[PDB]
């Protein structure tokens, strides 16, 4: 290893994590990323779960935030764990069908990029359009990077991405756990913790609940 | 006591021990499961 | 209703035999006091008798005109009318154990054939070897089939024979 | 070495190159059933078929069981589903079993003759061109081709671990089916309901506290 | 070689570029052997021609008002008096079944005794459109692509009927009346839980 950051200062890190991935702090106490093929898979899995969890915590909080602020949606005040029972123009059936067809397309595209990097950088129809060569799996760029980032700043930005994404994955785990234990919305849990933080610890609530 | 355990490994002693074991197993099976005319359990 | 045999739960001679045995036991029991050692013994014997009769009638056994349970040896009649636990199931139950014994003894013989004095390993048993083989003889049917298919269960014409073949 | 008993003397027939290539070789052969290499090959095939069949069946037991405990389905218990499915069916269970035995005997006889001679069902002219795709692969029990749509066996990097995952999940699922059977015979409830009853009171709801497993206790 | 079927996936080496309809789609590697591949090349065109005719018929029987493809054979059962374009035909099930056996036996035996023949010019090419030329290759590609589309479409007929119970045009009208409330996801068959 080296003088890189570490999840535990002084700990003898495993070594196969040597900074080349974003957010490398040596945390692999179960040695799940020991084999480089499993590590190449888990890097992309981390990126994907991370980005989807970031989107999810955004779409759970900022609706909750906009509703507690007092804006008007048809879908305001409906909990994130109750938005499926909500009625829309289509039943959830057709929504899952369309979702899975479209995601089959784009996820098989992403998987073709992962299997053979540099392959899915081209449109079916408009071949004038393409993604810039030299990209990595998980970081397509081009039309996925339209606002003009990735020129410099890229290691800083990848570290930022994976840090916010780990935080968001933990936040979604917390949404699930808090909605299963407290049975309420997450920002209302924040409000009940900020009301009196000393009588609303998880220890306190879980002891009172049994 | 290598020679004593060689004696205990002799055909008559081993036969006595093994048949005491088999008979005791059958006797205990017939005490705890008495009168087993048919396989029904 | 297999060979004119009535179930022991419906036969009256079976109940007659039960009450006869119990009458014998209680006529012996009348001689002793309330809780003597003989009284305890005879009450336990009566309980064993009642339990035995209940457990034979519960097992679907067929009875004759004498009220005694008759076993069905035929597979096909035992499996059609639920009498497989009489002779059919214990058949393979026995054959497993008998092939166990034979296979274990065979393996012991074959293992001690290699020693310099194989005869003194038969009057003085190699107990660790014997126990190893006794434990690993639980899979005797599979091992015997696989030794049969290799042609290594049988000896060829190296066995000895009398002069007129 | 990755043994089942770290201090055991592993049998010499499971330390051979021909046996250490087998998936999930932890030296477990206390009865010496695979001392014959041919028997070890045949029993490896038997282990694979049992493990895949048990994986499929135990999934079909506990996944719909979990989904009917969660309301997503109303599948009856696995010890009741045959009667329920045959009372809603187009066929008696006898004709069903006959068609099933014919269709399964065909493919299992093909698998049998491939075990007898590896790569023999690719004898040209046997099927209608499909025999080309029935040669199997270099490894017996891992046929590939039409049985491998996603092409996950064409790596030679994840292949050993794919094997290991298969055989380990399959041994686990075989144990799981044996447990379904024993738990039905000892409790009278479903496997997921057994899990629930154990998770609501583990220290008084287990095999030590039913009247079947330990009659002495 | 016309198309890739998976942009980036390099083509299998056993599928020749001169094969009409070659997109490199053999993930199961069924056509790795040349004789298997020849049989499959003939059978694909045969299945495709039969499926083109079958889809044309299932669409023409409903667009002209004589019911759907599934309910057409229920004159043999459920009574009698077969019809064609409304004209009732004097053949019961047994007579036309036997004549179909005889005629198709003669035809497909004449076809099988020819070995592998998939493009029999002459009596089957009277208007002279294919003479093993640029147009012939292009037309073979067109034929095999319309045949693959028609095979997919007949599989769709069967699945949509087994899920919905409607006809092809009836299901199309249902979908155009409610594209989001009437699709494969909204029936209680295709997707398991909903
Ligand atoms: C060959 C003729 C023959 C036959 C077939 C029988 C058969 C029987 N006799 Mg009769 N008997 C015979 C000769 C015979 N006997 C003779 C010659 C005598 C005079 C000595 C007697 C005197 C006699 C009496 C006095 C009694 C019997 C009884 C019985 C029953 C025994 C049931 C039992 O013990 O369950 C045992 C059940 C088992 C399952 C044991 C099988 C052995 C092992 C344990 C199985 C293996 C399990 C497992 C793999 C082991 C793992 C390893 C282990 C080390 C842990 C059975 C019907 C008894 C009875 O009730 O009859 C109705 C009884 O009371 N017999
Ligand atoms: C495949 C794994 C597996 C799992 C997870 C369970 C789980 C359970 N079993 Mg089942 N069971 C199994 C296999 C399994 N069993 C097998 C193979 C048998 C036949 C010997 C049984 C026979 C059995 C009976 C008779 C009963 C249970 C019961 C139970 C429950 C309480 C545990 C208990 O009493 O000890 C389980 C009993 C054993 C003898 C232990 C067998 C476990 C084997 C060796 C595999 C698991 C060991 C593994 C190293 C650690 C767990 C793996 C897990 C993380 C996947 C629990 C839900 C009880 C119940 O229904 O309570 C509500 C009960 O009465 N089980
Ligand atoms: C990831 C993810 C997922 C799966 C969802 C899923 C959902 N969101 Mg959430 N959301 C997310 C991210 C996500 N959101 C983010 C990142 C933000 C910011 C929001 C803000 C948000 C609001 C403010 C609302 C939802 C609502 C909804 C529900 C209906 C959405 C709809 O009608 O389609 C919308 C489909 C579109 C195509 C519009 C998006 C336009 C973009 C720019 C183009 C693509 C559904 C449960 C609604 C709800 O709760 O209904 C009950 C609702 O009011 N979301
Ligand atoms: C990120 C994926 C995700 C997650 C975590 C959830 C989680 C949940 N969904 Mg949602 N759902 C999803 C994707 C997801 N769904 C998708 C893709 C669809 C199709 C558009 C739906 C359609 C859906 C419906 C229609 C319903 C749920 C419901 C539920 C809840 C089930 C509660 C339970 O077990 O009882 C739970 C909060 C139920 C719910 O909220 O009831 C309270 C409900 O009725 N979901
Ligand atoms: C993203 C991190 C995160 C954050 C900020 C919170 C915040 C909160 N949680 Mg939640 N929670 C989380 C993750 C998180 N949780 C996860 C992953 C789980 C699953 C185990 C839970 C399960 C859970 C339950 C069951 C309950 C809470 C409750 C609470 C509240 C009171 C705190 C408490 O009692 O201790 C809870 C603390 C933990 C469970 C420890 C998790 C710590 C995470 C993994 C790392 C924290 C990051 C960093 C070191 C510190 C924060 C930095 C930054 C955010 C400022 C508070 C609003 C309680 C509530 O509703 O209050 C009213 C309550 O009953 N949480
Ligand atoms: C030893 C020779 C023998 C004899 C004389 C019989 C005699 C009979 N068998 Mg049985 N049978 C035997 C061996 C024998 N069986 C064996 C070894 C098997 C294989 C397990 C069967 C399986 C069998 C079946 C499955 C059936 C018979 C039936 C019959 C009856 C016709 C008749 C009573 C039939 C029956 O029940 O008769 C009413 C019937 O259905 N037999
Ligand atoms: C019927 C299913 C079945 C079969 C055929 C096999 C076959 C095999 N296993 Mg597997 N195994 C199984 C189930 C099975 N196993 C299950 C359920 C477990 C988990 C408990 C294991 C755990 C296991 C380990 C950990 C290892 C093996 C190994 C082996 C191989 C060497 C043993 C041998 O030759 O015995 C052949 C065995 C049989 C023919 C089974 C006979 C069944 C008996 C007679 C009844 C047992 C009933 C039971 C006690 C209840 C062989 C290929 C070793 C290996 O992979 O080396 C290559 C090894 O290290 N097995
Ligand atoms: C060894 C594998 C195996 C076997 C033998 C069975 C056998 C059975 N399953 Mg199960 N099942 C399995 C795997 C298996 N399943 C798996 C892997 C899944 C998850 C995908 C399911 C999910 C499942 C559900 C959800 C249901 C069944 C049902 C059934 C029954 C009717 C069969 C059927 O649908 O008609 C044959 C079907 C064909 C396509 C042919 C039958 C008892 C049904 C049942 O129990 O009805 C009473 C039922 O509702 N199964
Ligand atoms: C195939 C299998 C299970 C298949 C299950 C199926 C099809 C289930 C089907 C269904 O449930 C569904 C889906 C739905 C239901 O409605 C209908 C049915 C039909 C009921 C289990 C095998 C289960 C097989 C088991 C449990 C085998 C265990 C073997 C062991 C432990 C062997 C141990 C040893 O042999 C070794 C390994 C080495 C030796 O040296 C030492 C010893 C100890 C001898
Ligand atoms: C769908 C189909 C075949 C699909 C095959 C596929 C996807 C194969 C895929 C792959 O193999 C490849 C390519 C390469 C491999 O490496 C990968 C896989 C994936 C394995 C055939 C349909 C083939 C369909 C055919 C031949 C249909 C014929 C229809 C007829 C004759 C209809 C007749 C009628 O409808 C009328 C006219 C009037 C009615 O009243 C009466 C009737 C009789 C119902």
Residue A188 CA to residue A107 CA, distance in Å, equals 35
Sign of the dihedral defined by the CA atoms of residues C154, C158, C159, C161, in that order: positive
Ligand 8 atom 49, closest CA: D75
DSSP string, C104-165: HHHHHHHHHTTSS-TTHHHHBT-HHHHHHHHHHGGGHHHHHHHHHHTT-SS--TTS---TT-
Find out whether E32 and D132 touch, Cβ atoms under 8 Å.
Answer: yes
Tell me the β-bridge partners of C7: C62
CA distance C165 to E42: 67
Residues 34-93 of D with CB under 8 A from C: 36, 38-39, 42
Measured in angstroms, the CA of E183 and the nearest CA of chain A are apart by: 7
Half-sphere CA count of C12, side-chain side, radius 13 A: 0
CB A190 within 8 A of CB A50: no
3-state SS string for A156-190: HHHHHHHHHHHHHHHHHHHHHHHHHHCCCCHHHHH
Q: Is A201 annotated as a binding residue?
A: yes
Q: D131, D124 in Cβ contact below 8 A?
A: yes
Cβ count within 10 A of residue C111: 16
Interface size between D and E, measured as CB pairs under 8 A: 35
Residues sharing a CB contact under 8 Å with residue D45, sequence separation 6 or more, in sequence order = D115, D140, D141
Q: Does residue B37 contact residue C83 with C-beta atoms inside 8 Å? A: no
Number of domains making up chain C:
1
- Set of chain C residues whose Cβ sits within 8 Å of the Cβ of D30: 135-136
CA distance A63 to A57: 10
Task: Name subunits touching B (3+ CB pairs < 8 A).
Answer: C
Cβ distance E26 to D148 under 8 Å? Answer: no
Report how far Cα A65 is from the mean position of its chain's Cα atoms: 20
CA pair distance A96, A119, nearest whole angstrom: 28
**Contact by Cβ (8 Å): E175, E185:** no
Q: Are strands E83-84 and C62-63 parallel, antiparallel or unpaired?
A: unpaired
Q: Which experiment gave this structure?
A: cryo-EM
CA-A167 nearest atom, ligand 5: 1
Ligand 10: which residue has its CA nearest to atom 25? Answer: E51
**CB proximity E124 to A under 8 Å:** no
A83 vs A179: CA distance, rounded Å: 14
Distance between CA atoms of residues A75 and E15, nearest Å: 54
Q: Pairing mode, if any, of strands E83-84 and C69-70?
A: unpaired
CB C73 less than 6 A from any atom of ligand 6: no
* Cβ(D51)–Cβ(D174) below 8 Å: yes
Is the CB of E47 inside a 6 Å radius of any atom of ligand 10? yes
Q: Taking Cα atoms as reference points, which of E106, E103, E85 lies closest to residue E95? A: E103
- Distance, in Å, from the CA atom of E15 to the CA atom of E34, rounded to the nearest integer, reads 9
Nearest CB to D39; choose among C136, C137, C146: C146
Question: Do residue E27 and residue D151 have CB atoms under 8 angstroms apart?
Answer: yes
Nearest alpha-carbon partner for A138 in A57, A23, A5: A23
Nearest to D76 by CA among D155, D152, D156, D189: D189
CA angle B24, C84, B34 (to 5 degrees): 30
Contact A97 E185 (CB under 8 A): yes
Please give, rounded to a whole number of angstroms, the shortest distance from the CA of D155 to a CA of chain A: 11
Phi, psi (rounded to 5 degrees) for C61:
-70, 145
Of D33, D36, D38, the CB nearest to C139: D33
Please work out whether the CB of residue A59 comes within 6 Å of at least one atom of ligand 4: no
Q: Is E162 helix (H, G, I), strand (E, B) or coil?
A: helix
Query: Helix/strand/coil (H, E, C) string of chain D?
Result: CCCCCCCCCCCHHHCCHHHHCCCCCCCCCCCCCCCCHHHHHHHHHHHHHHHHHHHHHHHHHHHHHHHHHCCCCCCCCCCCHHHHHHHCCCCCHHHHHHHHHHHHHHHHHHHHHHHHCCCCCCCCCCCCCHHHHHCCCCCCCCCCHHHCCCCCCCCCCCHHHHHHHHHHHHHHHHHHHHHHHHHHHHHCCCHHHHHHHHHHCCCCCCCCCCCCCCCCC
- Answer whether D132 sits within 8 Å of E40, measured CB to CB: no
Cα radius of gyration rounded to whole Å, chain E: 20
D194 is in an annotated binding site: yes
* Other Cβ atoms closer than 10 A to C125: 21
- Report the alpha-carbon distance of residue E37 to residue E19 in Å, rounded: 10
Ligand at shortest distance from the CA of A164: 5
* DSSP sequence for B1-31: -HHHHHHHTBHHHHHHHHHHHHHHHHHHHHH
In a mutational test of the D interface, the residue from A37, A85, A111, A116 whose CB has the highest number of chain D CBs within 10 Å is A37
Ligand 3: residue whose CA is nearest its atom 22: A63
Nearest Cα to Cα of residue E107 among E170, E158, E40, E49: E49
CA–CA dist C14, C66 (Å, integer):
7
Q: Are E69 and E57 in contact (CB under 8 A)?
A: yes
Determine whether A22 is exposed, middle or buried from the number of CB atoms within 10 Å of its CB (0-12, 13-18, 19+): buried
Q: Given an 8 Å threshold on Cβ–Cβ distance, is C58 in contact with B40? A: yes
Task: Spell D173-192 as b/e; 16+ CB within 10 A means b.
Answer: bbebbeebeebbeebeebbb
Of C136, C149, C150, the CB nearest to D32: C136
Q: Is E9 exposed, middle or buried (0-12, 13-18, 19+ CB in 10 A)?
A: middle
Q: C127–B14: do the CB atoms touch at under 8 Å?
A: yes
Residue A44 in contact with residue A138, Cβ under 8 Å?
yes
Label residue D32 left, alpha or beta by phi (over 0 means left) and psi (-120 to 50 means alpha).
left
C-alpha radius of gyration, chain D, whole number: 21
Residues in chain E that come right before a backbone break, where C and next N are over 2.5 Å apart: none
Minimum-distance ligand 7 atom for the alpha carbon of D35: 34
Find out if CATH 1.20.5.510 is the number for domain B1-41. yes
Using an 8 Å CB-CB cutoff, list residues of chain C that contact chain B: 48, 51-52, 55-56, 58-61, 69, 71, 85-86, 89-90, 93, 122-127
Which of A90, A116, A120 is opposite residue E181, by nearest beta carbon? A90
- For chain D, say whether C110 makes contact (Cβ under 8 Å): no
Indicate the length of chain E as a whole number. 194
Residue of chain B whose alpha carbon sits nearest to that of C53: B35
Nearest CA to ligand 8 atom 48: D75
Going from the Cα of E23 to the center of ligand 10, the distance in angstroms, rounded, reads 19
How far, in Å, is the centroid of ligand 10 from the Cα of E166?
19
Tell me how crowded residue D55 is: count the other CB atoms within 10 A of its CB.
Answer: 19
- The domain in which residue C38 lies consists of 1-165
Interatomic CA distance for residues A111 and D19, integer angstroms: 36
Q: What is the distance between the alpha carbons of residues A43 and A21, in angstroms, rounded to a whole number?
A: 8
Cα E66 to Cα E74: distance, rounded to the nearest angstrom:
12
Probe site for chain A from E9, E180, E186, E191 (most A CB atoms < 10 A): E180
Q: Would you give the end-to-end CA distance of chain C in angstroms?
A: 53
Torsion of CA A13, A14, A16, A22, to 10 degrees: -40
**Under a CB-based contact definition with an 8 Å cutoff, are residues D36 and D162 in contact?**
no
Please classify residue C3 by burial: count the beta carbons closer than 10 Å to its beta carbon, then call 0-12 exposed, 13-18 middle and 19+ buried.
exposed
Distance CA D165, CA E60 (A): 53
Dihedral over alpha carbons A138, A142, A143, A146 (to 10 degrees):
110
- A90: CB partners within 8 A, 6+ apart: E180, E181
The vertex-C117 CA angle with C116 and C121, nearest 5°, equals: 120
Biggest alpha carbon distance in chain E?
58
Rounded to whole angstroms, the Cα distance separating C42 from C22 reads 10
Helices A36-69 & A186-195, crossing angle to 10 degrees? 70
Residue nearest to atom 41 of ligand 6 (CA): C76
- CA–centroid distance, residue C77 to ligand 6 (Å): 7
Q: How far is CA D200 from CA D61, D204, D206, E181, in A?
A: 22, 9, 11, 43
C14 close to C64: Cβ distance less than 8 angstroms? no
> Could you tell which of A178, A204, A209 is best to mutate to test the pocket of ligand 5, judged by most ligand atoms within 8 Å of the CB?
A178
Tell me the C-alpha distance between D16 and D22, whole Å. 10
Cβ atoms of residues C81 and C11 within 8 Å = no
Q: What are the residues facing C18 on neighbouring strands?
A: none
Asked if chain C contacts chain E via 3 or more Cβ pairs within 8 Å, the reply is no
Give the whole-angstrom CA distance, residue A122 versus residue A140: 11
Which residues, including other chains, have CB under 8 Å from residue D162's CB and lie 6 or more apart?
D152, D153, D155
Judge whether C130 and B16 are in contact, CB under 8 Å. Answer: no
The finding on whether D176 has its CB within 6 A of some atom of ligand 9 is: no
A123 contacts A129 by C-beta, under 8 angstroms:
yes
Nearest residue of D to residue E26 by CA position? D149
| Contact of E39 with D128, CB cutoff 8 Å | yes
């Amino acid at each position: 290893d080296a003088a890189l950051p570490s999840w535990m200062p002084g700990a003898d890190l495993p070594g196969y994590l040597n900074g080349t991935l974003p957010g490398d702090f040596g945390f692999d106490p179960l040695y799940l990323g020991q084999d480089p093929v499993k590590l190449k898979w888990y890097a992309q899995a981390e990126l994907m779960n991370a980005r989807f969890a970031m989107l999810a915590v955004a779409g759970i909080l900022v609706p909750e935030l906009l509703s507690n602020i007092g804006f008007s949606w048809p879908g305001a005040g409906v909990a994130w764990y109750d938005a499926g029972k909500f009625e829309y123009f289509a039943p959830a059936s057709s929504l899952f069908g369309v979702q899975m067809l479209l995601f089959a397309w784009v996820e098989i595209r992403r998987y073709q990029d992962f299997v053979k990097p540099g392959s899915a950088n081209q449109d079916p129809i408009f071949t004038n359009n393409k993604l810039p060569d030299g990209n990595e799996p998980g970081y397509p760029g081009g039309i996925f990077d339209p606002f003009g980032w990735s020129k410099g700043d890229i290691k800083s930005l990848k570290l930022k991405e994976i840090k916010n994404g780990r935080l968001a994955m933990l936040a979604f785990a917390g949404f699930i756990g808090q909605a299963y234990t407290t049975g309420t919305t997450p920002l209302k849990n924040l409000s009940t913790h900020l009301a009196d933080p000393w009588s609303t610890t998880v220890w306190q609530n879980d002891l009172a609940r049994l | 006591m290598k020679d004593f355990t060689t004696y205990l490994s002799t055909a008559p002693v081993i036969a006595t021990i093994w048949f005491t074991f088999t008979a005791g197993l059958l006797i205990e099976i017939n005490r705890y499961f008495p009168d087993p005319l048919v396989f029904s359990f | 209703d297999i060979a004119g045999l009535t179930p022991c739960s419906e036969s009256k001679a079976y109940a007659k035999l039960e009450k006869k045995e119990l009458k014998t036991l209680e006529k012996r029991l009348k001689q002793y006091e309330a809780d003597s050692a003989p009284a305890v013994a005879l009450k336990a014997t009566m309980e064993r008798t009642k339990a035995r009769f209940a457990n034979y009638a519960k097992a679907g056994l067929l009875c004759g005109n004498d009220g005694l349970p008759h076993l069905i040896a035929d597979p096909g009649l035992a499996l059609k009318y639920g009498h497989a636990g009489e002779v059919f199931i214990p058949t393979f139950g026995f054959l497993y154990v008998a092939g166990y014994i034979g296979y274990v003894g065979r393996q012991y013989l074959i293992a001690v054939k290699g020693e310099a004095k194989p005869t003194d390993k038969e009057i003085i048993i190699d107990v660790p070897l014997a126990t190893k083989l006794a434990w690993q003889g639980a899979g005797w049917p599979l091992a015997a089939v696989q030794e049969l298919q290799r042609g290594t269960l049988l000896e060829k014409e190296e066995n000895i024979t009398v002069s007129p073949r | 070495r990755q043994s089942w008993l770290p201090g055991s003397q592993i049998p010499a027939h499971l330390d051979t190159p021909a046996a250490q290539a087998l998936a999930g070789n932890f030296g477990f052969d206390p009865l010496g059933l695979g001392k014959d290499p041919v028997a070890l090959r045949w029993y490896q095939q038997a282990e694979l078929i049992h493990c895949r069949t048990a994986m499929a069946g135990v999934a079909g037991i506990l996944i719909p069981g979990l989904l009917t405990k969660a309301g997503a389905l109303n599948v009856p218990e696995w010890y009741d589903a045959g009667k329920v499915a045959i009372e809603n069916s187009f066929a008696p269970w006898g004709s069903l079993l006959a068609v099933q035995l014919f269709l399964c005997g065909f493919v299992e006889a093909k698998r049998w003759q491939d075990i007898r001679k590896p790569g023999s069902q690719g004898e040209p002219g046997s099927f209608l061109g499909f025999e080309a795709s029935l040669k199997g692969t270099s490894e017996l029990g891992y046929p590939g081709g039409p049985f491998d749509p996603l092409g996950l066996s064409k790596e030679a990097d994840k292949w050993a671990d794919w094997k290991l995952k298969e055989v380990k999940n399959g041994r686990l699922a075989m144990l799981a089916f044996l447990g379904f059977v024993a738990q039905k015979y000892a409790t009278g409830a479903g496997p997921v309901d057994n899990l629930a009853a154990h998770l609501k009171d583990p220290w008084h709801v287990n095999y030590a506290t039913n009247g079947v497993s330990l009659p002495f206790l | 070689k016309a198309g890739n079927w998976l942009p980036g996936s390099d083509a299998p080496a056993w599928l020749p570029d001169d094969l009409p309809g070659n997109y490199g789609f053999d993930p199961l590697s069924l056509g790795k052997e040349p004789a298997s591949l020849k049989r499959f090349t003939e059978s694909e065109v045969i299945h495709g021609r039969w499926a083109m005719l079958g889809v044309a018929g299932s669409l023409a029987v409903e667009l002209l008002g004589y019911g759907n493809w599934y309910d057409a054979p229920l004159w043999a059962v459920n009574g009698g008096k077969a019809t064609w374009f409304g004209i009732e035909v004097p053949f019961d099930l047994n007579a036309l079944l036997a004549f179909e056996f005889v005629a198709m036996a003669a035809a497909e035996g004449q076809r099988g005794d020819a070995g592998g023949v998939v493009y029999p010019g002459g009596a089957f090419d009277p208007l002279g459109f294919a003479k093993d030329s640029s147009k012939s290759g292009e037309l073979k590609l067109k034929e095999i692509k319309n045949g693959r589309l028609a095979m997919v479409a007949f599989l769709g007929f069967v699945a949509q009927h087994a899920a919905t119970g409607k006809g092809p045009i009836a299901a199309l009208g249902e979908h155009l009346a409610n594209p989001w409330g009437a699709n494969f996801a909204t029936n209680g068959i295709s997707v398991p839980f909903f």
